[PDB]
Design a binder for these strands. Structure first.
Ligand SMILES: [Mg+2]
Ligand SMILES: [Mg+2]
Ligand SMILES: [Mg+2]
Ligand SMILES: [Mg+2]
Ligand SMILES: [Mg+2]
Ligand SMILES: [Mg+2]
Ligand SMILES: [Mg+2]
Ligand SMILES: [Mg+2]
Ligand SMILES: [Mg+2]
Ligand SMILES: [Mg+2]
Ligand SMILES: [Mg+2]
Ligand SMILES: [Mg+2]
Ligand SMILES: [Mg+2]
Ligand SMILES: [Mg+2]
Ligand SMILES: [Mg+2]
Ligand SMILES: [Mg+2]
Ligand SMILES: [Mg+2]
Ligand SMILES: [Mg+2]
Ligand SMILES: [Mg+2]
Ligand SMILES: [Mg+2]
Ligand SMILES: [Mg+2]
Ligand SMILES: [Mg+2]
Ligand SMILES: [Mg+2]
Ligand SMILES: [Mg+2]
Ligand SMILES: [Mg+2]
Ligand SMILES: [Mg+2]
Ligand SMILES: [Mg+2]
Ligand SMILES: [Mg+2]
Ligand SMILES: [Mg+2]
Ligand SMILES: [Mg+2]
Ligand SMILES: [Mg+2]
Ligand SMILES: [Mg+2]
Ligand SMILES: [Mg+2]
Ligand SMILES: [Mg+2]
Ligand SMILES: [Mg+2]
Ligand SMILES: [Mg+2]
Ligand SMILES: [Mg+2]
Ligand SMILES: [Mg+2]
Ligand SMILES: [Mg+2]
Ligand SMILES: [Mg+2]
Ligand SMILES: [Mg+2]
Ligand SMILES: [Mg+2]
Ligand SMILES: [Mg+2]
Ligand SMILES: [Mg+2]
Ligand SMILES: [Mg+2]
Ligand SMILES: [Mg+2]
Ligand SMILES: [Mg+2]
Ligand SMILES: [Mg+2]
Ligand SMILES: [Mg+2]
Ligand SMILES: [Mg+2]
Ligand SMILES: [Mg+2]
Ligand SMILES: [Mg+2]
Ligand SMILES: [Mg+2]
Ligand SMILES: [Mg+2]
Ligand SMILES: [Mg+2]
Ligand SMILES: [Mg+2]
Ligand SMILES: [Mg+2]
Ligand SMILES: [Mg+2]
Ligand SMILES: [Mg+2]
Ligand SMILES: [Mg+2]
Ligand SMILES: [Mg+2]
Ligand SMILES: [Mg+2]
Ligand SMILES: [Mg+2]
Ligand SMILES: [Mg+2]
Ligand SMILES: [Mg+2]
Ligand SMILES: [Mg+2]
Ligand SMILES: [Mg+2]
Ligand SMILES: [Mg+2]
Ligand SMILES: [Mg+2]
Ligand SMILES: [Mg+2]
Ligand SMILES: [Mg+2]
Ligand SMILES: [Mg+2]
Ligand SMILES: [Mg+2]
Ligand SMILES: [Mg+2]
Ligand SMILES: [Mg+2]
Ligand SMILES: [Mg+2]
Ligand SMILES: [Mg+2]
Ligand SMILES: [Mg+2]
Ligand SMILES: [Mg+2]
Ligand SMILES: [Mg+2]
Ligand SMILES: [Mg+2]
Ligand SMILES: [Mg+2]
Ligand SMILES: [Mg+2]
Ligand SMILES: [Mg+2]
Ligand SMILES: [Mg+2]
Ligand SMILES: [Mg+2]
Ligand SMILES: [Mg+2]
Ligand SMILES: [Mg+2]
Ligand SMILES: [Mg+2]
Ligand SMILES: [Mg+2]
Ligand SMILES: [Mg+2]
Ligand SMILES: [Mg+2]
Ligand SMILES: [Mg+2]
Ligand SMILES: [Mg+2]
Ligand SMILES: [Mg+2]
Ligand SMILES: [Mg+2]
Ligand SMILES: [Mg+2]
Ligand SMILES: [Mg+2]
Ligand SMILES: [Mg+2]
Ligand SMILES: [Mg+2]
Ligand SMILES: [Mg+2]
Ligand SMILES: [Mg+2]
Lengths: 46, 10
RNA sequence: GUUUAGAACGUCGUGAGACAGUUCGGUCCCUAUCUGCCGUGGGCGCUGGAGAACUGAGGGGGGCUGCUCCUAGUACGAGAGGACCGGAGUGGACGCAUCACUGGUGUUCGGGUUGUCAUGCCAAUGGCACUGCCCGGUAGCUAAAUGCGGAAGAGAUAAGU
RNA sequence: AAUUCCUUGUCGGGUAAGUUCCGACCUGCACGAAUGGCGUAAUGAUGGCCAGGCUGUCUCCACCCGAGACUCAGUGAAAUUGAACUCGCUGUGAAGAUGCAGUGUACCCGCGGCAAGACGGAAAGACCCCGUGAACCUUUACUAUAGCUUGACACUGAACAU
RNA sequence: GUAACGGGGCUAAACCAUGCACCGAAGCUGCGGCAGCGACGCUUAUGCGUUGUUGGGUAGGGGAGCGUUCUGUAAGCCUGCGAAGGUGUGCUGUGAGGCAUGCUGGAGGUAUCAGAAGUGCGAAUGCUGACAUAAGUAACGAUAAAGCGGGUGAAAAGCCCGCUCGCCGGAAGACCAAGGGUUCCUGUCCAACGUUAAUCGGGGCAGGGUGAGUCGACCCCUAAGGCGAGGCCGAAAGGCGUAGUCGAUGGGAAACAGGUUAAUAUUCCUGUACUUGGUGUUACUGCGAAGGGGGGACGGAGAAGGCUAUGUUGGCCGGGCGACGGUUGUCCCGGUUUAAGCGUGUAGGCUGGUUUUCCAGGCAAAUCCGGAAAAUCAAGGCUGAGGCGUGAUGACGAGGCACUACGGUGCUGAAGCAACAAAUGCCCUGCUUCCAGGAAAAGCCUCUAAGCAUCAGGUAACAUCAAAUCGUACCCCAAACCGACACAGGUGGUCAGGUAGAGAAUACCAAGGCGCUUGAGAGAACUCGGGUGAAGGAACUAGGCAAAAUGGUGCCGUAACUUCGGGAGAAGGCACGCUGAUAUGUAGGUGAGGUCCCUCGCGGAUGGAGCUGAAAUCAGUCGAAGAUACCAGCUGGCUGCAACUGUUUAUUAAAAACACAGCACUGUGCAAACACGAAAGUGGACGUAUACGGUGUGACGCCUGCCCGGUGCCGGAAGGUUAAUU
RNA sequence: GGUUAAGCGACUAAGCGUACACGGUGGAUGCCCUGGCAGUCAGAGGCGAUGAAGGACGUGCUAAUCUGCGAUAAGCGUCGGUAAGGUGAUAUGAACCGUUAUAACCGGCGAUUUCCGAAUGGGGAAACCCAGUGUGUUUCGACACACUAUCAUUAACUGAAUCCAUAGGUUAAUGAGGCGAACCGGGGGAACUGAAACAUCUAAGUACCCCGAGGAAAAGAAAUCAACCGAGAUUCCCCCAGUAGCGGCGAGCGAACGGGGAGCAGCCCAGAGCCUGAAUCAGUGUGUGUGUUAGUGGAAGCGUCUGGAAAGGCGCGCGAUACAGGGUGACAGCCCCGUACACAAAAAUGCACAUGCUGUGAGCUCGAUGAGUAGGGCGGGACACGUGGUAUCCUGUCUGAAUAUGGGGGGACCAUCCUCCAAGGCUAAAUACUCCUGACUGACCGAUAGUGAACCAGUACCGUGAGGGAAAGGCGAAAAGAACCCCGGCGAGGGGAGUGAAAAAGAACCUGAAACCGUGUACGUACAAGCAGUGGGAGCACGCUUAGGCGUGUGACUGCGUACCUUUUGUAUAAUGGGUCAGCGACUUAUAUUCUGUAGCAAGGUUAACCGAAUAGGGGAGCCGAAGGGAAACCGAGUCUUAACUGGGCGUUAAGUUGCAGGGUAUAGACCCGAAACCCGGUGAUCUAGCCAUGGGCAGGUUGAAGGUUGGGUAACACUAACUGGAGGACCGAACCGACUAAUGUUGAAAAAUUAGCGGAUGACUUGUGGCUGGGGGUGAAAGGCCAAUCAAACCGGGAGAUAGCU
């Protein structure tokens, strides 16, 4: 039965990618929080 | 989780 | 049925809604540890060991009944009617055993047949299609099939004589 | 009558027997005309009722074929659990006892089964009530408010007519 | 289950009345011990034969202590002659405790008196970790099915090989996209992983493997949409949006066949092609846009016709003479394959064609497009399957002989045709028809402006360069993706064999791929999935739930009612196999040779061979049964509700609910009402009352009566009342 | 003696119980710290277009990762320091480089510094794609550099409608872009909560969002206060004082004057001269002084004992401006590193003083004296002050002066009197904070603690995403990490051997507890009923004793005896809690106040900030007490009440105050755990709903509308017949889609499916790939449905330890 997750690399990068996040300050604040937290992977982009 | 069984009375 | 969330009627309420008013629809989970119960074993005991056949303390099962016939168309009754007591026969329900008979089943027996595949091919067979679909059917199991059972007799009694 | 409480109203039809169904009656507790009324072919995994066929649905279950259940080998959970040397009865007792009293019964221990009890397991009860709890929703509850609308002033000046 | 003496039992072992005994409590008294308190004797912060008396206890109040970690005491003391810690034992205090010791351990520990607290745990469905219980119980994941021999190995039901059996075969096969990311191949290993074992594996480990001018991506082009210079708007942030710039799921240049690896291939190799640019040479020469025009370029449904894929049969080639009757035969088996490209332009589709002339149009211009006229031609042009030829004296090819590591390698290699059937593929982006009226842009073609017209540039022919970069293994309806699992689930596209059949249904098979990662026995109850059933036939049950039954084609026949369409497949009935005949293989379809005609070809007309091939009738024949299996409607009658197809509570409700066409009311004059937005703006709508929004009703038929008091709405404005302001 | 009879009769343990012994599992306890926690004293408070922060990919003798570094890639140059050893770590090895100064290492200064990222040539799904221009190369295929973002400012050149102009346009210069902890200023700005409800109010101008800046920021040089005396910018601390006041006068909020301290600093414009470059400030060089960024020297012990090892014991010394610490085989002043002291800089740089240039103007005189402003009306806000009688401040709105002969303020207002001069600016110090650097400290933690992280931790892992977020330390002194032999599958595992003090330290490694699970021994147990114990007690076993019998284990048999906690009038209760063990887990802290105890002083007691070599001392600013009464003025051992009290009320004999400890109260989370919710900022339409764009799919078999043709009929129709036609949210039925019934399954094969049937199946169909709508919002053929397994208000983070009269 179809579940909530249907993988799509193009959709995934357009939704949460580095350029999508950095386009707005609110997403840029996510990067600031993840940089402050010390995340190994800042964004979802490979 | 669960869904409160309805075997209850009135 | 009642008893959620859907919906509708009547009714109440400005309304959301409400009504032991009504209508339609609407998830019933648990692999048994213990007690209990039904079966079936292991261990040990019972004073040498072992193999049998018993006694029965105790416990359980079973305990129903109709209708005809004879007594007797007698007792009783004006008649209409019609027995007690006692003795036969034949059923119902229930229970037990059994498969000789009557049947069921008998995907392990035999045959018929459809489609297709294979055995080189024909013929003859086999596979698969619910046992392909069917027709029969041994033993066994089985009831609807057929045998049997309920008692009589004692003891002590209930109410009552 | 999806609307009738009394009520299974009354009558008729259907059945051996019909609180349902169908037809009427009107006594409409508490129908009613676009919050539509009455009819209506067709349509409907639509509701109710009836008939034929059909059958193990049932009288009343029997047999057979498979998959489990059972035995062996291997792997190997779970919910639950205060501790247990965890019997019946009658009575008592936070008022329904394996555990108290009295009394009866019962050698020790598995296996296959059945679920009567352990107020069995599941989930800090959804019903009821409570808290000067929560939330949504309603309105002619309260207090506001967006919006809409009214006028004054400002943006905004100059003739004429009443 | 006696159950109304606790029971036994009792005729006193009951009751009544007198006694004298005895039993009976943590009460009382003895004999010790501890503590509190009161007034004393001496002495008294201490204490004394003190003495008297008190000492059940929750909430709670008061008082006094133990122990733990840390600081001072402590650069002390204890300690490798065994510290802490742990584990025993002994002693001791009213208690929390203390002391000492045996063993363990192997380096710290700490008196005393003070000081400070993360200072004392059984509970909180407490938290974390560990370990039980049920329990060696349930389960080991679709009932598609396995069996044997051999091999490897320490070991084989599970691995490998071989021979059988069974399952899928519109899939359980093949190829992809998406997604995964090495799972691919080889070697090696069996701890863990695999619901068992495992020599095996999608496990561990080590190597190897993905080769492109043509396939994709990238690239050019745009859709929805995103971003957005300036700009507009907004407390700030920001919002909207122009020019622009992104964004495929769409539009744009080109490759096919054969061979080859353990794993890659339209990528490598062989053979044969094609395309777009760059450069150079040569010839002929008007070029040219951020411009114009054309083109690209487009629906649904339906109807055929022409084809191919493909299949069948025959022919041909090769092989077979049959494990058991027959089988030299009209017998049996197998093969009978060849692309892109190039040439031809066919069936067919579309369009009249060719000049000259004029013109306020196509933002300017235009020779182009669009217009106006005139002339002349009976044609011309465009598009397009397929076939044929070439590609191809090649490749492929059954098989053959030699070698060899079961592989293989090398050599050779026959026929390689026809008829028929036939698509959902192609012609077809066609044709016909309908209303709901069916992208864009660029590449491409053409036209001229400005700017060059010796040049440049354009056209044509050769030669030549260049075609980068990234993806390419493998899975891809699943054990590799989404579901926590090697999960009875989900997941888009392409391919579509034989027999029967209308069919992609269904059954049996081919190619191909599998038997689903625990088995072996037993053959109880009971449960699940099924089979059959005497007699009755809904008596069952809320209810014919379920099951059983019906089921096909042809023909006959078919009611009430109806909106005339229906109802209707109404109901109901008849015929179905096989063989022969009509007619040895028919009607029909297809159609060669041959013979005429051609302004000549992929031609036309005859012609009928050969193939393919129903349907009907008659006769015969078998069985209980001929739509024999699978497959495949139960029917009728009354009635409520909703007109109907549809929609809905993903995961207990599919309905009478919602929607619905229709109807009516009302708002709305377009800078519309309204809605989203502090606003700009956007939607409404690039629409204009024959429109749009809101509301209610809910096809159709017949109809929709009375009330404006209340509450709303609309209109009026004289009067009463009334804000800011003055 | 034999044979019978009767009575009694131990010995059995499948197993089990208790005790003990020996193990297994497990990792508690103890010990340990290259990790944390809280501070002290300093420094440093930014980085970035000269390309940051943060990454991606590379880079070694390198397979991976870590740490460095960037194609010059664990590095290169130079200048110093230092050097006999050295090529970072896991982590050996290999191949080498050095050894008296070009090994290596450290520091200063440079060079290089791929790709992404403000990212800046364009684009983009970050680490990728695609260019343009120009210079220079040539092998004629190409190649190498450089430049090309936007905005602001400035200057040139050009350049509309439109004649000039202006807008606009093109260049060229500068500057800005981003990141970063807290502190600061400003623009916006909650709710939970408290009020035992709840509107004003509180929470709170807090949380949060946004803008901007600095090492501090801000504020700041009186149109200020005072009160008839005076003070003299701002900021900060202690008082004043929980006072005056504010307030559904409730909850609560809460000054100022004045005083004590820290630190002090004043100027410029609103204009012209006379003087003149004056003072001062800013640039820069130039030295000095003092730092910073590498370093150098640095005292003094032997013997003996125990022991694997001495730093321990026992002897006898020595140094100390060094007995701070660390390490070394057990506890080291003299073994080592250091420490106390004494020194050091080629180069860079801070700070301070001096000095030289470049600006900069000092002084004097005469003027001038901040207008849509003050004020006012209206509406709000800020002042402790909520409109109140409300001054003062800010202004959305509407008005509107005086102007030194004048204005502002003195808490309504007026007069008088004091005080000051707004409508222009600048200004150090005292103050706040710590991402970061260095040193040091702790009655702070010691692996369930301390940061989430002592370990390759913001990792593994979870989630679409925002976001959430772990577990996991210890062999020994030295790996000496067990050669060799044996069993086993050329295994695993084990037995020997060997190493070591010890393997009773063997890598599943310090110590090794408990639950739990085993082996052995003793005793008990197979006719026996129940919280499993207790009192009594035989027998057996065993240890002492000598026969006194005790001690230990077990325990037949027997009297009595229904767990614990919580909550209750009341529980064996069949009421709640708990499978067990171990670890952790709840009345604290700060301030204020009262009371008690105790100590000190005493009609007095005591300081706070601050100063201070500083727990001393100074500082008495203040606070409490010694006098009260009254609303108050006032009076006073009295006073008030009243006209007045013989009165009556309250007072007058009675020691307090400051510490420490403790009992209460108050504000903070206030003993701990637990809500459903409210508010704020973000993340989600890869699921689902709707919509948009672009593609795809729907085997087969029926019914046969309109229309058309040909007849028949009509004057023509109409009408009628036949044949063509192929209409439909048409029919039957696969794919596909739906999900009506039943069974199964219900700790599933599956957190919604399977099997057999069922509905639709050319359409209001279905589907792929993209896109759009976001939380009081979406979307919804409408069920309160759906919006990532969550919906009558999603998810994540924050307010937040909301609140919880309840358990
Ligand atoms: Mg019901
Ligand atoms: Mg059910
Ligand atoms: Mg049940
Ligand atoms: Mg027989
Ligand atoms: Mg049979
Ligand atoms: Mg054959
Ligand atoms: Mg079969
Ligand atoms: Mg028979
Ligand atoms: Mg008798
Ligand atoms: Mg007798
Ligand atoms: Mg009698
Ligand atoms: Mg009724
Ligand atoms: Mg009747
Ligand atoms: Mg009726
Ligand atoms: Mg009505
Ligand atoms: Mg009406
Ligand atoms: Mg019906
Ligand atoms: Mg019937
Ligand atoms: Mg368990
Ligand atoms: Mg029990
Ligand atoms: Mg009882
Ligand atoms: Mg059992
Ligand atoms: Mg049962
Ligand atoms: Mg509740
Ligand atoms: Mg109440
Ligand atoms: Mg007493
Ligand atoms: Mg007492
Ligand atoms: Mg200490
Ligand atoms: Mg300690
Ligand atoms: Mg000891
Ligand atoms: Mg040691
Ligand atoms: Mg504690
Ligand atoms: Mg087993
Ligand atoms: Mg069991
Ligand atoms: Mg089983
Ligand atoms: Mg399986
Ligand atoms: Mg085998
Ligand atoms: Mg098959
Ligand atoms: Mg792998
Ligand atoms: Mg493989
Ligand atoms: Mg093994
Ligand atoms: Mg592998
Ligand atoms: Mg190639
Ligand atoms: Mg490539
Ligand atoms: Mg292509
Ligand atoms: Mg925009
Ligand atoms: Mg802009
Ligand atoms: Mg595309
Ligand atoms: Mg069309
Ligand atoms: Mg063909
Ligand atoms: Mg033969
Ligand atoms: Mg033609
Ligand atoms: Mg491939
Ligand atoms: Mg492959
Ligand atoms: Mg799941
Ligand atoms: Mg999975
Ligand atoms: Mg699918
Ligand atoms: Mg069976
Ligand atoms: Mg059957
Ligand atoms: Mg029958
Ligand atoms: Mg029969
Ligand atoms: Mg009945
Ligand atoms: Mg039924
Ligand atoms: Mg009908
Ligand atoms: Mg009815
Ligand atoms: Mg549902
Ligand atoms: Mg649905
Ligand atoms: Mg349903
Ligand atoms: Mg309606
Ligand atoms: Mg009226
Ligand atoms: Mg009215
Ligand atoms: Mg210690
Ligand atoms: Mg409150
Ligand atoms: Mg600075
Ligand atoms: Mg030195
Ligand atoms: Mg002034
Ligand atoms: Mg004013
Ligand atoms: Mg005001
Ligand atoms: Mg007043
Ligand atoms: Mg007031
Ligand atoms: Mg005021
Ligand atoms: Mg640990
Ligand atoms: Mg250990
Ligand atoms: Mg006994
Ligand atoms: Mg006892
Ligand atoms: Mg307790
Ligand atoms: Mg209990
Ligand atoms: Mg419990
Ligand atoms: Mg005191
Ligand atoms: Mg002092
Ligand atoms: Mg004083
Ligand atoms: Mg007085
Ligand atoms: Mg206190
Ligand atoms: Mg408290
Ligand atoms: Mg239809
Ligand atoms: Mg259908
Ligand atoms: Mg239908
Ligand atoms: Mg959901
Ligand atoms: Mg809410
Ligand atoms: Mg949150
Ligand atoms: Mg708060
Ligand atoms: Mg809380």
């Amino acid at each position: 039965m179809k579940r909530t997750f249907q993988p799509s690399v193009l959709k995934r990068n357009r939704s949460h990618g580095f350029r999508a996040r950095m386009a707005t300050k609110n997403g840029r604040q996510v990067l600031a929080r993840r940089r402050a937290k010390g995340r190994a992977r800042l964004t979802v982009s490979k | 989780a669960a869904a409160v069984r309805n075997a209850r009375w009135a």
